[PDB]
């Protein structure tokens, strides 16, 4: 399992190694976005939390059609904040449940080492 640890201050220099193989060895979910917020990547880990399959969401928009429910401010807001900056690092608790048992989790948003991306990182609280 690959070992990093969940809000890790070189995070996004870790992740620019790794591949789709190697991001479903992580013990929290990541996700990566480009700024309109279409999915690039989605691990295993992600999966698990949300009850989604990782290769087929891959390509839609997380906020339009994923995710729904972190289409407010205090998510999406956030996020399209970031991107227009071209800086984001930001950590909160939010409610997943959008056609799913609601669940709490951590969510960590970083802007990737790479051109115009974004992480989000998931864990359960």
């Not at 339009?64 to 900056?85: H, L, M, Q």
């Not at 802007?111 to 359960?124: C, H, N, Q």
Request: charged share 25%; aromatic share 12%.
């Amino acid at each position: 399992m690959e070992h990093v640890a969940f809000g890790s201050e070189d995070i996004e220099n870790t992740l620019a190694k790794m591949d789709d193989g190697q991001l479903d060895g992580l013990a929290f979910g990541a996700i990566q976005l480009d700024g309109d917020g279409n999915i690039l990547q989605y691990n295993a880990a992600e999966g698990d939390i949300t009850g989604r399959d990782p290769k087929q969401v891959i390509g839609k928009n997380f906020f339009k059609d994923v995710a729904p429910c972190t289409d407010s401010p205090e998510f999406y807001g956030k996020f399209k904040e970031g991107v227009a900056s071209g800086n984001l690092n930001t950590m909160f608790e939010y409610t997943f449940d959008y056609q799913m048992t609601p669940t709490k989790v951590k969510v960590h948003m970083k802007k990737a080492l790479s051109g115009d991306s974004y992480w989000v990182f998931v864990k359960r609280v």
